[PDB]
Amino acid sequence: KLDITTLTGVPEEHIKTRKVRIFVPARNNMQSGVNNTKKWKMEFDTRERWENPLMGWSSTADPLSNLVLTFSTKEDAVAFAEKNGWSFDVEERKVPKPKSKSYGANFSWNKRTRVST
Amino acid sequence: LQHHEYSTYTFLDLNVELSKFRMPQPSSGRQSPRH
Amino acid sequence: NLIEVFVDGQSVMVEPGTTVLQACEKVGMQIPRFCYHERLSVAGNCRMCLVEIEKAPKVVAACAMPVMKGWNILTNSEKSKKAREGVMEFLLANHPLDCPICDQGGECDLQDQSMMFGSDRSRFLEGKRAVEDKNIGPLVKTIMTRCIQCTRCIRFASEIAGVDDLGTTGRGNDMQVGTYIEKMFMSELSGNIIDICPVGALTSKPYAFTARPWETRKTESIDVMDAVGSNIVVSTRTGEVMRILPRMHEDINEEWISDKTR
Amino acid sequence: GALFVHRDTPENNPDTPFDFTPENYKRIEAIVKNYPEGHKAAAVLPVLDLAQRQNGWLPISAMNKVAEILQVPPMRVYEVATFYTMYNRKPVGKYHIQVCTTTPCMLRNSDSILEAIQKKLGIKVGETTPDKLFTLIEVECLGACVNAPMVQINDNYYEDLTPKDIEEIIDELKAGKIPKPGPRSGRFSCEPAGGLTSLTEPPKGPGFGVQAGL
Amino acid sequence: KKTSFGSLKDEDRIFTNLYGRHDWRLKGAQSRGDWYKTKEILLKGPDWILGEVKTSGLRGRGGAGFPTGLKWSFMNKPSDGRPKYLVVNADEGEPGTCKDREIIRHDPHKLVEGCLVGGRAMGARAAYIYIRGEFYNEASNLQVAIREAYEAGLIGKNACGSGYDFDVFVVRGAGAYICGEETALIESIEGKQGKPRLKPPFPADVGVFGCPTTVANVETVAVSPTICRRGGAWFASFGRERNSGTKLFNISGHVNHPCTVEEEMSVPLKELIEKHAGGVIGGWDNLLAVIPGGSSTPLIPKSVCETVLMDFDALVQAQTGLGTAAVIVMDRSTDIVKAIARLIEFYKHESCGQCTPCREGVDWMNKVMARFVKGDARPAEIDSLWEISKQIEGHTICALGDGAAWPVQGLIRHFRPELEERMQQFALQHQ
Ligand SMILES: Cc1cc2nc3c(=O)[nH]c(=O)nc-3n(C[C@H](O)[C@H](O)[C@H](O)COP(=O)(O)O)c2cc1C
Ligand code: SF4
Ligand code: SF4
Ligand code: SF4
Ligand code: FES
Ligand code: FES
């Protein structure tokens, strides 16, 4: 029942009207590396972005647009969200299921796994 | 000295002759791996 | 019947037939790779997976070597690091200096693995090779000069897509990937070769030159084009959608999305 | 220097007419009988050799026909055609002069034979005579390194060659006469030039030194 | 117990018709002792044949020289329902190697009876003899001999009346040196590109058509019937321990009488060159950097050549290999750099390309060696090339990469001063 909301100084609109997403970032499918999928991340909900009339740069009014936090475990992120009074959605970690790989299978005598090239 | 006179299809024709002596081939059980 | 093997002295129990690379994953070590995709078949051509097993004179490819009981996998031994440096040098000997203009720039496995397991300078004092570009369709922009013959595209097309139109022509350093004829690679999962390609040899034509990886903000979402419900990552920069990338969900879509979704 | 991509041309378009003769079809059937059922893709190499022998070179239509007959994807046939050197993906001369320029043959002054062939034919290596009867190509070890120099023609080995010998053989081929394959010097085989230092005695015969317990 | 080998009588020569003077047909082979009591050998059993091979101490003639008996005994396990095959490697792709050509051309029935004996030993239904495509006439001769054996019933159903069904198929290559590799050979027979597989799945367990298959060099298969008939101890008598047998030797290069001769293993290299090859051109003084066992094996300078013995372990001590037993001889009037660079160019033209070390490093070595023969390089490029070769060796999935690295290492180790002299001379020329 810890509540730091009064002490944080965050204005009430972002405390109440923002949904924070707790998740482990998925691997960038362009790369096979997995080092960026080992820590939980807290990200706020996306808001409106509009073009500046003068230059066309994207302007925002969301202070927490770029705020992202790293947490070792899901429970730590949940506790931080609760202590800060942010509504939170938790996406369970997705792990690659174990696979059975056999280089011999590429030359099966009767199975369809034989590779044409 | 026999090798001096061999045609283009000599090897394949010899294979055709040998086809009769060949024993039955073993089968994977499927027409093709793609099958 | 789990057997006991050691990775850098740490005991890990793996089922028989497990590859050395998979045990290294079990202990958390990600063996560097360029030709191994878990979805695809094992090929053993990248040679970056060469790791040293204790008391074994010859390094072995982690992707293609089933583990044996009692083996100790030295993933950071001097032999392993030297093999990695040599393989990286051979890969980069002919690779073109296209990083600034290559769309893969910033998300290139070749770049990152060179920064992490390769030398910081080049001893290649000769001319590099150049390969004529092949046209495989209106979706995949092709620069074959950057190809490393990892054979991921070929194996993917053969196994997942099921279209046996991509293959390797020639032998030696002149070996080239791609249709020997002017055929177009048409399939639902054709765009996935862009994702599967480690290098920017095969890249997205609509996405070409538009944006760089670090700029993009990634939002995880679900596709609506089909009722499959494939998980996707919507990459947006400055409030504009730049590209759609697959997101892994083993139950629904392993790592692929349809061309329409992409 | 040959490219490994196919650019469609009027001579080498997919509609170029090629089909196996019925005798060649029977030969193909015998070939397929050799390999086990369910692995008829093993016949790609001999059938491609048969097609090249029938046509003299392999057009794309021939590769497609081989793929259709053996029920294999055409890309596999293209890979086989490109990978192996013996297959000719371009039209070649009546007689294909293949000069072994590897180190063993090189030591036996193979370059002299090569230069003699160039001068007599008038074509540099990798070119075809305007008469389209002779194509000169250098190759690697052909297996007759001991009898070097050695140049191969369509299927015959003319080994232990001298520039005069190669010029004479080219003249015979031009006249339409078929030279006898083999060492054009005194020797008949891998035999020592001066005389047999081994196997001088007659063969021992059956039952010689046979282990008693058999 | 004999401390000096090198003299072999015609009686103990296995390849009696090596030079082809006698008839190569079935009548000639039977007159020369081939196909004699083969029925008894087959009826004796697979174990006795394998034990005879093991007692013979035969080492593989392809170049790797693994113990033949154990290599074949790997196949002795009971069948799982899949067929078993024996593949005779007749690629003859190693530069300088011509022994298998003579074997197939002039004594084909030897190879056929060897195939029957080995397939009985391996429990193989059939044998495929993969012959280099350029060897068309030899392939036709082998086919003729196979036809004759089929007519006589020596092969086929109830082969030699032994109740064993065996077939020999001749498959012709399409001009690739790499096909000589056992896994590359298996793939080539399977109809794909002749690109060697990975070793972990061994050929014994998975081979041609995904079935148990053993690959043996033509000489290794051909000597099997004579080893069985004469006895394993007979083969063991010739040569040193662990190097037993009589090995065909191909002497080429700067020799007065290039020839292929059969002699006992461990024969002194000087004795083989002077006795049979007619001696080095210009005398033994003109000797420079004999290639002991074909291109793959590193060169040995003249000084080592004086006292070296031509056997596996001894030449390994000489930092070289017996290899295919092909002896290539260079006189002092030879650019050793040019010869080695031409060999590396051969390796470049014959690489598959699948393995990145081979695909890129072999071309890199070829370009560097070309610059070397030109002399257009700095001295440290020697060390750089050595390190490149070391990277290639032991990493390539195939052994062609090591086969390419070894010549470079030998050339550096034994002739670095020539390389440095040529570089200095080039620099002086261009100023
Ligand atoms: C690149 C390469 C080329 C080879 N070429 C041949 C060859 O032409 N003939 C041959 O018998 N073995 C060749 N081999 C050796 C074979 O791979 C295999 O070791 C041999 O056939 C085994 O014969 P053995 O049982 O007598 O040792 C080659 C090996 C490599 C790596
Ligand atoms: S694909 Fe090649 S050129 Fe493009 S970023 Fe990666 S390393 Fe650089
Ligand atoms: S094009 Fe890309 S995926 Fe295909 S082999 Fe080359 S690097 Fe691999
Ligand atoms: S080492 Fe070279 S020739 Fe051997 S399999 Fe690898 S790429 Fe092919
Ligand atoms: S990708 Fe692992 S050995 Fe090449
Ligand atoms: S070196 Fe000429 S045939 Fe091999």
CSV table of N, CA, C and O in Angstrom, one decimal, chain E residues 135-200:
chain,number,residue,atom,x,y,z
E,135,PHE,N,38.1,-39.1,-67.2
E,135,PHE,CA,38.6,-40.5,-67.4
E,135,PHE,C,37.5,-41.3,-68.1
E,135,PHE,O,37.1,-42.3,-67.7
E,136,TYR,N,37.2,-40.9,-69.3
E,136,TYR,CA,36.1,-41.5,-70.1
E,136,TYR,C,36.5,-42.9,-70.6
E,136,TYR,O,35.8,-43.9,-70.4
E,137,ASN,N,37.7,-43.0,-71.2
E,137,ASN,CA,38.1,-44.3,-71.7
E,137,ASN,C,38.4,-45.3,-70.6
E,137,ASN,O,38.0,-46.5,-70.8
E,138,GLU,N,39.0,-44.9,-69.5
E,138,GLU,CA,39.2,-45.7,-68.4
E,138,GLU,C,37.8,-46.2,-67.8
E,138,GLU,O,37.7,-47.4,-67.4
E,139,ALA,N,36.9,-45.3,-67.8
E,139,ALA,CA,35.5,-45.6,-67.3
E,139,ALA,C,34.9,-46.7,-68.2
E,139,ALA,O,34.3,-47.6,-67.7
E,140,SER,N,35.0,-46.5,-69.5
E,140,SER,CA,34.5,-47.5,-70.4
E,140,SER,C,35.2,-48.9,-70.2
E,140,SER,O,34.5,-49.9,-70.3
E,141,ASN,N,36.5,-48.9,-70.0
E,141,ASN,CA,37.2,-50.1,-69.8
E,141,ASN,C,36.7,-50.8,-68.5
E,141,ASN,O,36.5,-52.0,-68.5
E,142,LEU,N,36.5,-50.0,-67.4
E,142,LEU,CA,36.0,-50.6,-66.2
E,142,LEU,C,34.6,-51.1,-66.4
E,142,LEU,O,34.2,-52.2,-65.8
E,143,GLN,N,33.8,-50.4,-67.2
E,143,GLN,CA,32.4,-51.0,-67.5
E,143,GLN,C,32.5,-52.3,-68.3
E,143,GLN,O,31.7,-53.2,-68.0
E,144,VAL,N,33.4,-52.4,-69.2
E,144,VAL,CA,33.6,-53.6,-70.0
E,144,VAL,C,34.0,-54.8,-69.0
E,144,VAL,O,33.4,-55.9,-69.1
E,145,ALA,N,34.9,-54.5,-68.1
E,145,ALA,CA,35.3,-55.5,-67.1
E,145,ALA,C,34.1,-55.9,-66.2
E,145,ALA,O,33.9,-57.1,-65.9
E,146,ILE,N,33.3,-54.9,-65.8
E,146,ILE,CA,32.1,-55.2,-65.0
E,146,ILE,C,31.2,-56.1,-65.8
E,146,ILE,O,30.6,-57.0,-65.2
E,147,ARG,N,31.0,-55.8,-67.1
E,147,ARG,CA,30.1,-56.6,-67.9
E,147,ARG,C,30.6,-58.1,-68.0
E,147,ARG,O,29.9,-59.0,-67.8
E,148,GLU,N,32.0,-58.2,-68.2
E,148,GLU,CA,32.5,-59.5,-68.2
E,148,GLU,C,32.3,-60.3,-66.9
E,148,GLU,O,32.0,-61.5,-66.9
E,149,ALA,N,32.5,-59.6,-65.8
E,149,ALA,CA,32.3,-60.2,-64.5
E,149,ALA,C,30.8,-60.7,-64.3
E,149,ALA,O,30.6,-61.7,-63.8
E,150,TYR,N,29.9,-59.8,-64.8
E,150,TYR,CA,28.5,-60.2,-64.7
E,150,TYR,C,28.2,-61.4,-65.6
E,150,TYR,O,27.5,-62.3,-65.1
E,151,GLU,N,28.8,-61.4,-66.8
E,151,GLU,CA,28.6,-62.6,-67.6
E,151,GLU,C,29.1,-63.9,-67.0
E,151,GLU,O,28.5,-64.9,-67.0
E,152,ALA,N,30.3,-63.8,-66.4
E,152,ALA,CA,30.8,-64.9,-65.7
E,152,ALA,C,30.1,-65.2,-64.4
E,152,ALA,O,30.3,-66.3,-63.8
E,153,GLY,N,29.3,-64.3,-63.9
E,153,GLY,CA,28.6,-64.5,-62.6
E,153,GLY,C,29.4,-64.2,-61.4
E,153,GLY,O,29.0,-64.4,-60.3
E,154,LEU,N,30.6,-63.6,-61.6
E,154,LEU,CA,31.4,-63.3,-60.5
E,154,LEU,C,30.7,-62.2,-59.6
E,154,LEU,O,30.9,-62.2,-58.4
E,155,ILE,N,30.0,-61.3,-60.2
E,155,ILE,CA,29.2,-60.3,-59.5
E,155,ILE,C,27.7,-60.6,-59.9
E,155,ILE,O,27.4,-61.3,-60.7
E,156,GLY,N,26.8,-59.9,-59.1
E,156,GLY,CA,25.4,-60.0,-59.3
E,156,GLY,C,24.8,-61.0,-58.4
E,156,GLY,O,25.2,-61.2,-57.3
E,157,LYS,N,23.7,-61.6,-58.8
E,157,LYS,CA,23.0,-62.6,-58.0
E,157,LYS,C,23.9,-63.8,-57.8
E,157,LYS,O,24.5,-64.3,-58.7
E,158,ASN,N,24.0,-64.3,-56.5
E,158,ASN,CA,24.8,-65.4,-56.2
E,158,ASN,C,26.3,-65.2,-56.7
E,158,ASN,O,26.8,-66.0,-57.4
E,159,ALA,N,26.8,-64.1,-56.3
E,159,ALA,CA,28.2,-63.7,-56.8
E,159,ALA,C,29.2,-64.8,-56.4
E,159,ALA,O,29.3,-65.1,-55.2
E,160,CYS,N,29.9,-65.2,-57.4
E,160,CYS,CA,30.9,-66.3,-57.3
E,160,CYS,C,30.3,-67.5,-56.6
E,160,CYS,O,31.0,-68.2,-55.9
E,161,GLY,N,29.0,-67.7,-56.7
E,161,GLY,CA,28.3,-68.9,-56.1
E,161,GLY,C,28.4,-68.8,-54.6
E,161,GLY,O,28.3,-69.9,-53.9
E,162,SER,N,28.5,-67.6,-54.0
E,162,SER,CA,28.6,-67.5,-52.5
E,162,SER,C,27.3,-67.2,-51.9
E,162,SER,O,27.3,-67.0,-50.6
E,163,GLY,N,26.2,-67.1,-52.6
E,163,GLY,CA,25.0,-66.7,-52.0
E,163,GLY,C,24.9,-65.3,-51.6
E,163,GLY,O,24.0,-65.0,-50.8
E,164,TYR,N,25.7,-64.4,-52.1
E,164,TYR,CA,25.8,-63.0,-51.7
E,164,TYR,C,25.5,-62.2,-53.0
E,164,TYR,O,26.0,-62.4,-54.0
E,165,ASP,N,24.5,-61.3,-52.9
E,165,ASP,CA,24.1,-60.5,-54.0
E,165,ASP,C,24.8,-59.1,-53.9
E,165,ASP,O,24.6,-58.3,-53.0
E,166,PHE,N,25.6,-58.9,-55.0
E,166,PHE,CA,26.4,-57.7,-55.0
E,166,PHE,C,26.4,-57.1,-56.4
E,166,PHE,O,26.5,-57.8,-57.4
E,167,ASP,N,26.3,-55.8,-56.5
E,167,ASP,CA,26.3,-55.1,-57.8
E,167,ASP,C,27.4,-53.9,-57.7
E,167,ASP,O,27.5,-53.3,-56.7
E,168,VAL,N,28.1,-53.7,-58.8
E,168,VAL,CA,29.0,-52.6,-58.9
E,168,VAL,C,28.4,-51.6,-60.0
E,168,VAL,O,28.2,-52.0,-61.1
E,169,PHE,N,28.3,-50.4,-59.6
E,169,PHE,CA,27.8,-49.3,-60.5
E,169,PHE,C,29.0,-48.4,-60.7
E,169,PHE,O,29.7,-48.0,-59.8
E,170,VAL,N,29.2,-47.9,-62.0
E,170,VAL,CA,30.2,-46.9,-62.3
E,170,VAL,C,29.4,-45.6,-62.5
E,170,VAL,O,28.6,-45.5,-63.4
E,171,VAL,N,29.8,-44.6,-61.7
E,171,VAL,CA,29.2,-43.3,-61.9
E,171,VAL,C,30.3,-42.3,-62.3
E,171,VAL,O,31.4,-42.4,-61.7
E,172,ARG,N,30.1,-41.5,-63.3
E,172,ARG,CA,31.1,-40.7,-63.8
E,172,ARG,C,31.0,-39.3,-63.3
E,172,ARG,O,29.9,-38.7,-63.2
E,173,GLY,N,32.1,-38.7,-62.8
E,173,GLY,CA,32.1,-37.3,-62.4
E,173,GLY,C,31.9,-36.3,-63.5
E,173,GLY,O,31.8,-36.7,-64.7
E,174,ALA,N,31.7,-35.0,-63.1
E,174,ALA,CA,31.5,-34.0,-64.1
E,174,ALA,C,32.6,-32.9,-64.0
E,174,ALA,O,32.4,-31.7,-64.3
E,175,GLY,N,33.8,-33.3,-63.6
E,175,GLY,CA,34.9,-32.3,-63.6
E,175,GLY,C,35.0,-31.5,-62.4
E,175,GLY,O,35.0,-30.2,-62.5
E,176,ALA,N,35.2,-32.1,-61.2
E,176,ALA,CA,35.4,-31.3,-60.0
E,176,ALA,C,36.4,-32.1,-59.1
E,176,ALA,O,36.2,-33.2,-58.8
E,177,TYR,N,37.5,-31.4,-58.7
E,177,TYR,CA,38.5,-32.0,-57.9
E,177,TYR,C,37.9,-32.2,-56.5
E,177,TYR,O,38.2,-33.2,-55.8
E,178,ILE,N,37.0,-31.3,-56.0
E,178,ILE,CA,36.5,-31.4,-54.6
E,178,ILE,C,35.7,-32.7,-54.5
E,178,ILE,O,35.6,-33.2,-53.4
E,179,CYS,N,35.1,-33.2,-55.6
E,179,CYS,CA,34.4,-34.5,-55.5
E,179,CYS,C,35.2,-35.6,-54.9
E,179,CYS,O,34.7,-36.6,-54.4
E,180,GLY,N,36.5,-35.5,-55.0
E,180,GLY,CA,37.4,-36.5,-54.4
E,180,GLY,C,37.1,-36.6,-52.9
E,180,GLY,O,37.4,-37.7,-52.4
E,181,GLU,N,36.7,-35.6,-52.2
E,181,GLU,CA,36.3,-35.7,-50.8
E,181,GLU,C,35.2,-36.7,-50.7
E,181,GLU,O,34.2,-36.7,-51.4
E,182,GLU,N,35.3,-37.5,-49.6
E,182,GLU,CA,34.4,-38.6,-49.4
E,182,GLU,C,32.9,-38.1,-49.2
E,182,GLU,O,32.0,-38.7,-49.8
E,183,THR,N,32.7,-37.1,-48.4
E,183,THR,CA,31.4,-36.5,-48.3
E,183,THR,C,31.0,-35.8,-49.6
E,183,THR,O,29.8,-35.8,-50.0
E,184,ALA,N,31.9,-35.0,-50.2
E,184,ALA,CA,31.6,-34.4,-51.5
E,184,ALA,C,31.3,-35.5,-52.5
E,184,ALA,O,30.3,-35.3,-53.3
E,185,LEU,N,32.0,-36.6,-52.5
E,185,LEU,CA,31.7,-37.7,-53.4
E,185,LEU,C,30.3,-38.2,-53.2
E,185,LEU,O,29.6,-38.5,-54.1
E,186,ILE,N,30.0,-38.4,-51.9
E,186,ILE,CA,28.6,-38.9,-51.6
E,186,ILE,C,27.6,-38.0,-52.1
E,186,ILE,O,26.6,-38.4,-52.7
E,187,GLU,N,27.7,-36.7,-51.9
E,187,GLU,CA,26.8,-35.7,-52.4
E,187,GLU,C,26.7,-35.7,-53.9
E,187,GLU,O,25.6,-35.6,-54.5
E,188,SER,N,27.8,-35.8,-54.6
E,188,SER,CA,27.9,-35.8,-56.0
E,188,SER,C,27.1,-37.0,-56.5
E,188,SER,O,26.4,-36.9,-57.5
E,189,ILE,N,27.3,-38.2,-55.9
E,189,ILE,CA,26.5,-39.4,-56.3
E,189,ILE,C,25.1,-39.1,-56.1
E,189,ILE,O,24.2,-39.5,-56.9
E,190,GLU,N,24.7,-38.4,-55.0
E,190,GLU,CA,23.3,-38.1,-54.7
E,190,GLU,C,22.8,-37.1,-55.7
E,190,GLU,O,21.5,-37.0,-55.7
E,191,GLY,N,23.6,-36.5,-56.5
E,191,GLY,CA,23.1,-35.6,-57.6
E,191,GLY,C,23.1,-34.1,-57.3
E,191,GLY,O,22.7,-33.4,-58.1
E,192,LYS,N,23.6,-33.7,-56.1
E,192,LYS,CA,23.6,-32.3,-55.7
E,192,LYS,C,25.0,-31.8,-56.1
E,192,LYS,O,25.9,-32.5,-56.6
E,193,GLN,N,25.3,-30.5,-55.8
E,193,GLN,CA,26.6,-30.0,-55.9
E,193,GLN,C,27.6,-30.7,-55.0
E,193,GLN,O,27.3,-31.1,-53.9
E,194,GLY,N,28.8,-31.0,-55.6
E,194,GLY,CA,29.7,-31.8,-54.8
E,194,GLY,C,30.4,-31.1,-53.7
E,194,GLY,O,31.6,-30.8,-53.7
E,195,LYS,N,29.6,-30.6,-52.7
E,195,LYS,CA,30.1,-29.9,-51.6
E,195,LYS,C,30.1,-30.7,-50.4
E,195,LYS,O,29.1,-31.3,-49.9
E,196,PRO,N,31.3,-30.9,-49.8
E,196,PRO,CA,31.5,-31.8,-48.6
E,196,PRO,C,30.5,-31.5,-47.5
E,196,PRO,O,30.3,-30.3,-47.2
E,197,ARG,N,30.0,-32.5,-46.8
E,197,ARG,CA,29.1,-32.3,-45.7
E,197,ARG,C,29.9,-31.9,-44.4
E,197,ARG,O,31.1,-31.6,-44.5
E,198,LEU,N,29.3,-32.0,-43.3
E,198,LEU,CA,30.0,-31.9,-42.0
E,198,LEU,C,30.2,-33.3,-41.4
E,198,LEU,O,29.4,-34.2,-41.6
E,199,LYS,N,31.3,-33.4,-40.7
E,199,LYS,CA,31.8,-34.7,-40.2
E,199,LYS,C,31.0,-35.3,-39.1
E,199,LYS,O,30.8,-36.5,-39.1
E,200,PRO,N,30.4,-34.5,-38.1
E,200,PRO,CA,29.7,-35.1,-37.0
E,200,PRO,C,28.8,-36.3,-37.3
E,200,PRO,O,29.0,-37.4,-36.8
